């Protein structure tokens, strides 16, 4: 690959420079390079990878939504809007296929701590979910099944090896509830998982660390915000 001649530590340093310069495509390409060296990522390095690709696919999802909604209104008018929406869509699928490729080829293992295995299974669920947002037909059904198996495997590990206020266990449940509601057309599953997750985190609400409390409590609130939205 294009980062094959660069030292791993230099790739990580340049990912941090790209982050400070807000150059998220560069940041992602440097982290891809780092992952391809074949060593495990630290927690800081996992978060650089996640930030870089979330920003890239985040911009594409937002553009896709702007264009999809312009397209919906003009179905009531040449092919330009649909063609451009299709172009953005195709780029967005390329990025998700890149991330899903990295998770399956390098990052998802039977070894490693529970935190790291859940982190990567959750990200697998997320990137299938972004594909499901734009998919149709038989393709969407295969994608929904893949998203569900990744999230469920992450749920099984998180419930048995992490405390119920751990921000990654919480973030995973949050994301999986959104999948239930917006993708899998299972509003009752969504609402049940979000309530249960919120309720089981209350026991420990007072005892968060200086690290988790803003993330923990922000996610607890996001669960409520969604529950409001959905009820």
């Amino acid at each position: 690959g294009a980062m094959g001649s660069m030292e791993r530590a230099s790739l990580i340093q340049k990912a941090k420079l790209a982050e400070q310069a807000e150059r998220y495509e560069d940041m992602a390409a440097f982290m891809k390079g780092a992952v391809e060296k074949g060593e495990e990522l630290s927690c800081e390095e996992r978060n650089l990878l996640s930030v870089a690709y979330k920003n890239v696919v985040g911009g594409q999802r937002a553009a896709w939504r702007v264009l999809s909604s312009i397209e919906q209104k003009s179905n009531e008018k040449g092919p330009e809007v649909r063609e451009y929406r299709e172009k953005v869509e195709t780029e967005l699928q390329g990025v998700c296929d890149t991330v899903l490729g990295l998770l399956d080829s390098h990052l998802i293992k039977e070894a490693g701590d529970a935190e790291s295995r859940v982190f990567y299974l959750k990200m697998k669920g997320d990137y299938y979910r972004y594909l499901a947002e734009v998919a149709t037909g038989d393709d969407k059904k295969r994608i929904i099944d893949s998203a569900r198996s990744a999230y469920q495997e992450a749920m099984d590990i998180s419930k048995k090896e992490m405390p119920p206020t751990n921000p990654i266990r919480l973030g995973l449940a949050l994301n999986f509830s959104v999948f239930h509601y917006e993708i899998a057309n299972s509003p009752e599953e969504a609402i049940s998982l979000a309530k249960t997750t919120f309720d089981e985190a209350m026991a420990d609400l007072h005892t968060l660390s200086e690290d988790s409390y803003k993330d923990s409590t922000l996610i607890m609130q996001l669960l409520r915000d969604n529950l409001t939205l959905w009820t």
């Binding site: 978060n47 996640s50 930030v51 979330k54 997320d126 973030g171 949050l174 994301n175 509830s177 959104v178 509601y181 917006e182 993330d215 922000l218 996610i219 996001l222 915000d225 969604n226 939205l229 959905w230």
Partner: peptide, 8 residues
Amino acid sequence: RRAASMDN
């Protein structure tokens, strides 16, 4: 309105 997912 779309539901919120995790940030970061």
